[PDB]
Amino acid sequence: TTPLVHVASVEKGRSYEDFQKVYNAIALKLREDDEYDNYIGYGPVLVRLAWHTSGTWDKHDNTGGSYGGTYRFKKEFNDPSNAGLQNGFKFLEPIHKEFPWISSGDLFSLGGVTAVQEMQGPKIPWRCGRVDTPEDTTPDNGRLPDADKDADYVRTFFQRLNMNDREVVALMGAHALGKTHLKRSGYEGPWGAANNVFTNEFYLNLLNEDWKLEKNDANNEQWDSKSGYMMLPTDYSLIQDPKYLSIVKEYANDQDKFFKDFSKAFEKLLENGITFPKDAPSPFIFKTLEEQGL
Ligand code: HEM
């Protein structure tokens, strides 16, 4: 069928102040619910939820993507690739209850932006206007990437999301956050030490740790260091491919450049598939709780 156009439609009468209140409620709950996942907190799972709800997009026919908020439907929430994201969704449930006017796509993507900023990451400009679409618009399972693959796979996979080498390497830096959980993905361990603070640690660890190719308890191969860190085969592919390797070295040597490129690629990922009218509001830059003295 003919590719649909998804036009951003501002939640009736809402403006920056309304969305800053939603950001604040998410940020305050991130601070309060600090026990989750052995005190990592919900920041990393909210970033992963924003990426997986956006990552289903197909540039060829504009199916999937963040616009429709379709993760709320069983086919997508039960995608094996989304195992564990129910924690991010449950976190956002009281937020949606307090702000019922926000669309599901706007909430999932805003959860990601809030988590990155609250974890001292870069500012991520964010635009409102995603509109909930019906159950039959839910994309099928299998549009999210496999972790047991090589650089050729990663590069080809991300062409579907209209991401180039620099955008892919910058986006993968989010693997500074959280960890792999054996029961969710068949991989186990964190990528680094500060896994609830957004830094360029992922690139420094790729380049500086002594990695060993081992089998985990799920019988899957992963790269492990004596420091207690791990890398997926797709992460390690970033230092196997010479084009990705040059970009990894750039981000490992320039925190500000990584922040600036991640911010652009992450906003692009969250906005793929959406048509913003010429007279839509400009993207919002939310203040963090710290900047507000809250
Ligand atoms: C080649 C592409 C990618 C692959 C194969 C991949 C794979 C995975 C895997 C297997 C996990 C562990 C899931 C679990 O066991 O809990 C994970 C976690 C995570 N992913 Fe990625 N990912 C990719 C790209 C990305 C991107 C583009 C982002 C965001 C920009 C992202 C953000 C995260 C975050 C924050 C976590 C930690 C979640 C948590 O701690 O609960 N990933 N990823």
Tab-separated table of C-alpha atoms in Angstrom, residues 41 53 161 258 282:
chain	number	residue	atom	x	y	z
A	41	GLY	CA	18.094	3.300	37.859
A	53	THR	CA	10.123	2.472	19.583
A	161	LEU	CA	17.000	4.078	9.282
A	258	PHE	CA	30.623	12.949	20.583
A	282	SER	CA	10.722	25.120	16.836
